[PDB]
Design a binder for this molecule. Structure first.
Ligand SMILES: CCCCCCCCCCCCCCCCCC(=O)OC[C@H](COP(=O)([O-])OCC[N+](C)(C)C)OC(=O)CCCCCCCCCCCCCCCCC
Ligand SMILES: Nc1ncnc2c1ncn2[C@@H]1O[C@H](COP(=O)(O)OP(=O)(O)OP(=O)(O)O)[C@@H](O)[C@H]1O
Lengths: 124, 290
């Protein structure tokens, strides 16, 4: 009963930071690589970040590398996305993802509901 | 009949010749086995024995095919010399105690004894060789070692002497599977050809039965071989156990990932064994005469 619940999104100004959480449930998260995708309206879902089962490696899309870090806590079954130096083009719904193989020809994707991150472009 | 010293020397030389000839197959198998472990940002993906060999040669040089070759030669000189030169002494100890023809069980037991002792003796060589074969400058993982003896010194002084025996139990398991499967499959196919008259008892029956047995042994030991390679290659802390590594391979990559590098593995097993057998018999007779 895989369940991914993303939280921590919101509306922040350009240059702001935001920490997204992903509570993973219904599976042994310690054996699975975890992914963060994002999708904005009018665009295809975009892979953002990936982290190993215990956090041994982390990989990022070139558009987010250095600004976004992916972190893990398997004792809490939580995956974190710290997003610094946010740009208005980072506005998207961010999705936590598990790709499960097991006894499968292809990996099967489990997604959360997504958490909306809007980066504001206002000048004060 | 060759002396046990002649047998050990001949097995060592034959194993070294086979290993130096077939080493690029070993490098290709290792590069295929660790391929999906960490995602790569490079466009260099390995596929097939020829594709992997050419990709390695053209992205990182001819010599990178023979990376860890001195470790492989040390593995021959110690491990394979023991495993091949002591086989007849062990087999005589077992079967000739009662003046018995060598049964399948006798062969299995002799091979298990020699292979287990050889695996334990030569595990440091396997660790260093696998870690040198798997290391690259292209896939975002930093190489740890500059060569065979540098790897020996670094592992010994940073991971302990026990860190040089990492992956011993998966290697023992692979050795058991290879031995049992090859011998049982060889006898089963020899009978199958003889009773369904498919081949009669010239050499081709023995040769085709050896080919099938070798492929079956490689296929049966492939999951353990992949897990062994990835566990041995892994730095301390990445995998809390060998079953942990296997479970992560299963959940993140599926069942077919347990047969990565199967074709290079089977090619190396077959070619290595043929070359080693020819050179070993030739060396034993050629020395033992003079
Ligand atoms: C005869 C045995 C081969 C020569 C002896 C080993 C040479 C050597 O130093 O290899 C180390 C290096 C690298 O080892 P290293 O990574 O441990 O340093 O391996 C080679 O590049 C040797 C290439 C040998 C090519 C043989 C082709 C088949 C004939
Ligand atoms: N008991 C056995 N029976 C037949 N062949 C074997 C046995 N043990 C090992 N081999 C094969 O002999 C070849 C050389 O042996 P070596 O000691 O280099 O094994 P390895 O390096 O641990 O395995 P690999 O060569 O697949 O990395 C290998 O291809 C291996 O598959």
């Amino acid at each position: 009963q895989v369940q991914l619940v993303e939280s921590g999104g919101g509306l922040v100004q350009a240059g702001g930071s935001l920490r997204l959480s992903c509570a993973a449930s219904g599976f042994p998260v310690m054996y699975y690589n975890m992914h963060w995708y994002r999708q904005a309206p009018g665009k295809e879902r975009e892979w953002v970040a990936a982290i190993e089962s215990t956090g041994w490696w982390a990989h990022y899309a070139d558009s987010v590398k250095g600004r976004f870090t992916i972190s893990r806590d398997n004792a809490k079954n939580t995956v974190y996305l710290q997003m610094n130096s946010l740009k208005p083009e980072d506005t998207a719904v961010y999705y936590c993802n598990v790709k499960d193989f097991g006894w499968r020809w292809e990996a099967y994707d489990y997604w959360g509901q997504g958490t909306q991150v809007t980066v504001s472009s206002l000048e004060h | 009949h060759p002396t046990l010293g002649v047998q050990l020397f001949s097995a060592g030389i034959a194993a070294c010749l086979a290993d130096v000839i077939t080493f690029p197959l070993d490098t290709a198998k290792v590069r295929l086995q660790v391929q999906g472990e960490c995602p790569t940002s490079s466009v260099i993906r390995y596929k097939g024995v020829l594709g992997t060999i050419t990709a390695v040669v053209k992205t990182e040089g001819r010599m990178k095919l023979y990376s860890g070759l001195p470790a492989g030669l040390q593995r021959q000189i110690s491990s394979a010399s023991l495993r091949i030169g002591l086989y007849d002494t062990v087999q005589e100890f077992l079967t000739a105690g009662k003046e018995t023809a060598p049964s399948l069980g006798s062969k299995i037991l002799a091979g298990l004894t020699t292979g287990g002792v050889a695996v334990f003796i030569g595990q440091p060589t396997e660790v260093v060789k696998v870690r040198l074969q798997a290391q690259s400058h292209l896939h975002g993982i930093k190489p740890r070692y500059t060569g065979t003896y540098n790897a020996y010194r670094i592992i010994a002084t940073t991971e302990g002497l026990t860190g040089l025996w990492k992956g011993t139990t998966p290697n023992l398991m692979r050795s058991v599977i290879i031995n049992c499967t090859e011998l049982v499959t060889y006898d089963l196919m020899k009978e199958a050809f003889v009773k369904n008259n498919i081949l009669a008892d010239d050499v081709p029956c023995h040769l085709v039965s050896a080919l099938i047995a070798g492929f079956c042994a490689t296929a049966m030991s492939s999951p353990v071989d992949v897990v062994k390679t990835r566990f041995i290659n892994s730095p301390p802390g990445q995998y809390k156990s060998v079953p942990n590594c296997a479970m992560k391979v299963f959940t993140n990559e599926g069942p077919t990932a347990f047969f990565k590098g199967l074709v290079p593995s089977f090619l190396r097993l077959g070619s290595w064994n043929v070359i080693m057998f020819v050179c070993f018999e030739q060396l034993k007779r050629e020395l033992s005469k003079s």
